[PDB]
From Swiss-Prot, chain A:
It comes from Mus musculus (Mouse). Ubiquitinated by TRIM11, leading to proteasomal degradation. The chain holds residues 669 to 786 of 789 of the full protein. Transmembrane segments: none annotated. It comes from the Eukaryota. It is found in: Cytoplasm; Nucleus. Belongs to the Mediator complex subunit 15 family. Component of the Mediator complex, a coactivator involved in the regulated transcription of nearly all RNA polymerase II-dependent genes. Mediator functions as a bridge to convey information from gene-specific regulatory proteins to the basal RNA polymerase II transcription machinery. Mediator is recruited to promoters by direct interactions with regulatory proteins and serves as a scaffold for the assembly of a functional preinitiation complex with RNA polymerase II and the general transcription factors. Required for cholesterol-dependent gene regulation. Component of the Mediator complex, which is composed of MED1, MED4, MED6, MED7, MED8, MED9, MED10, MED11, MED12, MED13, MED13L, MED14, MED15, MED16, MED17, MED18, MED19, MED20, MED21, MED22, MED23, MED24, MED25, MED26, MED27, MED29, MED30, MED31, CCNC, CDK8 and CDC2L6/CDK11. The MED12, MED13, CCNC and CDK8 subunits form a distinct module termed the CDK8 module. Mediator containing the CDK8 module is less active than Mediator lacking this module in supporting transcriptional activation. This is Mediator of RNA polymerase II transcription subunit 15.
Curated annotation (Swiss-Prot), chain B:
A motif (LXXLL motif 1) lies at residues 125-129. GO terms for molecular function: nuclear thyroid hormone receptor binding; transcription coactivator activity. Component of the Mediator complex, which is composed of MED1, MED4, MED6, MED7, MED8, MED9, MED10, MED11, MED12, MED13, MED13L, MED14, MED15, MED16, MED17, MED18, MED19, MED20, MED21, MED22, MED23, MED24, MED25, MED26, MED27, MED29, MED30, MED31, CCNC, CDK8 and CDC2L6/CDK11. The MED12, MED13, CCNC and CDK8 subunits form a distinct module termed the CDK8 module. Mediator containing the CDK8 module is less active than Mediator lacking this module in supporting transcriptional activation. The chain holds residues 4 to 247 of 987 of the full protein. The keyword Cell inner membrane does not apply. This is Mediator of RNA polymerase II transcription subunit 24. Expressed in the adrenal gland, brain, epididymis, heart, kidney, liver, ovary, pancreas, prostate, skeletal muscle, small intestine, spleen, stomach, testis and thymus. Keywords: Activator, Nucleus, Phosphoprotein, Repeat, Transcription, Transcription regulation. It comes from Mus musculus (Mouse). Component of the Mediator complex, a coactivator involved in the regulated transcription of nearly all RNA polymerase II-dependent genes. Mediator functions as a bridge to convey information from gene-specific regulatory proteins to the basal RNA polymerase II transcription machinery. Mediator is recruited to promoters by direct interactions with regulatory proteins and serves as a scaffold for the assembly of a functional preinitiation complex with RNA polymerase II and the general transcription factors. Required for basal and activator-dependent transcription. It is found in: Nucleus.
UniProtKB/Swiss-Prot annotation, chain C:
Component of the Mediator complex, which is composed of MED1, MED4, MED6, MED7, MED8, MED9, MED10, MED11, MED12, MED13, MED13L, MED14, MED15, MED16, MED17, MED18, MED19, MED20, MED21, MED22, MED23, MED24, MED25, MED26, MED27, MED29, MED30, MED31, CCNC, CDK8 and CDC2L6/CDK11. The MED12, MED13, CCNC and CDK8 subunits form a distinct module termed the CDK8 module. Mediator containing the CDK8 module is less active than Mediator lacking this module in supporting transcriptional activation. This is Mediator of RNA polymerase II transcription subunit 23. Component of the Mediator complex, a coactivator involved in the regulated transcription of nearly all RNA polymerase II-dependent genes. Mediator functions as a bridge to convey information from gene-specific regulatory proteins to the basal RNA polymerase II transcription machinery. Mediator is recruited to promoters by direct interactions with regulatory proteins and serves as a scaffold for the assembly of a functional pre-initiation complex with RNA polymerase II and the general transcription factors. Belongs to the Mediator complex subunit 23 family. It comes from Mus musculus. It comes from the Eukaryota. It is found in: Nucleus.
Length: 118, 233, 162
């Protein structure tokens, strides 16, 4: 009895059920065993692409606003359009009551990216 | 070949230039071969431009440098013989885009190709050297000052130092040519341009000289204590 | 205390290793001067009843025009330093003189120096002396000296005002 590969299965099992529009991968494993959560996602759809988020979560109780935007400053000072995208992103994230990293994060991010077209 | 007329039609209409990505992904098989990406446009779009910065299209490059193939852009803007053209205007836009490019850091290539990226970086510096060419005549200010400024900026320590070291320890001929060009530029910089100018250039030269030496060379001091190990042994 | 010691004594100018005793436990690091230091301590290890009243006068003149650099200051400090308890107990009137002498040495080394090399040692030394022995008495007098110090030293001793 041991996982030996990741956190409790529920998170991966649920995220693997998402749309093909999202493309999730892992960065250098700085929390390989216990944390095992720092996701890099690439929105692939009929919309403009952007920088992937951080998405570093906590134990499965999920009181985790996972994204921390490690590359916030310079990647966001680039263009006004993506700056407005980031503004709408954080504004909608603030509206999320007890956000849930599993689905709420990526869904809200996609909604904000689709709101960018004004 | 369709890519050229495609990006032309893109410019031919006043697109939002961020929805442009949608049309780009649509017009292409979306992953067939990205070696024919925006990388070459910057050249060809500027080809007929000549003595003109060609604005309203650099916005595409701006919305692209967020996440694209930075290696191809780097090597092509390095090999671009634009200082030879001596437009003195487009080169400024090149400095501006290189600012947003290199200031923070480069990106990953997920393969050994990224190492070659570092290689391109070397050639990049050579390009910046030809900024002094804009002052080679000196028969009559802003351009040389700005070029040396952005050069010193891109030469931030602990950021590209390892990449320059990799470049130097992966090939020599280009490194020797870059060193000779640096020596020549330093020699050419023996004129009293300004107080701010011709000062930091020596600093960047010393940085390049220290590049092959080490990153943690033994420079510590103030070790006030009688060494007992040597004594005892 | 003044053989040459001002232009450039030697690379041995590290004050702490020299001025500290028990270095004689090895057959080296026993420079004559350091010995003399313990010598003083020696008598002051047992003559600590009323003889200390001699050192303030002995300071006020003699130690003034003999100190230029900083390790001489550390030397005279080690000479007078570890006895403030005897003044706090009995010779209360003399500890103020000892303190103003300390600060006079400070002003002297400040006025004649290219740069202070061992700032933090003297800093936390004075911190200890203030917080543990002078209480809150001399605060005013040292002010009339502490204001005319170097800007770096000023920022360093900023919190002495209270």
């Amino acid at each position: 009895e041991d996982e030996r590969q990741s956190i409790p299965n529920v998170l991966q099992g649920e995220v693997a059920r998402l749309d093909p529009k999202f493309l999730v991968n892992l960065d250098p494993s700085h929390c390989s065993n216990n944390g095992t959560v720092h996701l890099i996602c690439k929105l692939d759809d009929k919309d403009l692409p952007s920088v992937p988020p951080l998405e570093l979560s906590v134990p499965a109780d999920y009181p985790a606003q996972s994204p921390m935007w490690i590359d916030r400053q310079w990647q966001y000072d680039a263009n006004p359009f993506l700056q407005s995208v980031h503004r709408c992103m954080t504004s909608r994230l603030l509206q999320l009551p007890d956000k849930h990293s599993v689905t709420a994060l990526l869904n809200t991010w996609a909604q904000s990216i689709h709101q960018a077209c004004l | 070949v369709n890519l050229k007329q495609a990006i032309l039609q893109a410019w031919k209409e006043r697109w939002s230039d961020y929805q442009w990505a949608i049309n780009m992904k649509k017009f292409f098989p979306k992953g067939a071969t990205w070696d024919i990406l925006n990388l070459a446009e910057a050249l060809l779009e500027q080809a007929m431009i000549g003595p003109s910065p060609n604005p309203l299209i650099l916005s595409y490059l701006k919305y692209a440098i967020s996440s694209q193939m930075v290696s191809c852009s780097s090597v092509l803007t390095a090999i671009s013989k634009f200082d030879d053209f001596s437009r003195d205007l487009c080169v400024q836009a090149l400095l501006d885009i290189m600012d947003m490019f290199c200031d923070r850091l480069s990106c990953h290539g997920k393969a050994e190709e990224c190492i070659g990226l570092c290689r391109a970086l070397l050639s990049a510096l050579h390009w910046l050297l030809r900024c002094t060419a804009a002052s080679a005549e000196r028969l009559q200010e802003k351009q040389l000052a700005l070029c040396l400024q952005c050069l010193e900026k891109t030469l931030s320590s602990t950021k590209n130092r390892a990449l320059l070291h990799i470049a130097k320890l992966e090939e020599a001929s280009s490194w020797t040519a870059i060193e000779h060009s640096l020596l020549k530029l330093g020699e050419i910089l023996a004129n009293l341009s300004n107080p701010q100018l011709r000062s930091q250039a020596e600093r960047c030269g010393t940085l390049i000289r220290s590049i092959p030496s080490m990153l943690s060379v033994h420079s510590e001091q103030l070790h006030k204590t009688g060494f007992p190990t040597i004594h005892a042994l | 205390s003044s053989s040459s010691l001002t232009s450039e004594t030697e690379w041995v100018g590290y004050p702490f290793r020299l001025f500290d005793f028990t270095a004689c436990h090895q057959s080296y690091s026993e420079m004559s001067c350091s010995y003399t230091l313990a010598l003083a301590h020696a008598v002051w290890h047992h003559s600590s009843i009323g003889q200390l009243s001699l050192i303030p006068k002995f300071l006020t003149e003699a130690l003034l025009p003999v100190v230029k650099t900083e390790f001489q200051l550390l030397y005279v400090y080690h000479l007078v330093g570890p006895f403030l308890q005897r003044f706090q107990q009995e010779r209360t009137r003399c500890m103020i003189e000892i303190g103003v002498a300390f600060y006079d040495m400070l002003l002297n080394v400040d006025q004649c120096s290219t740069h202070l090399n061992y700032m933090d040692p003297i800093c936390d030394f004075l911190y200890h002396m203030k917080y543990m022995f002078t209480g809150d008495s001399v605060k005013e007098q040292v002010e009339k000296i502490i204001c005319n110090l170097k800007p770096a030293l000023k920022l360093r001793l900023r919190f002495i005002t209270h």
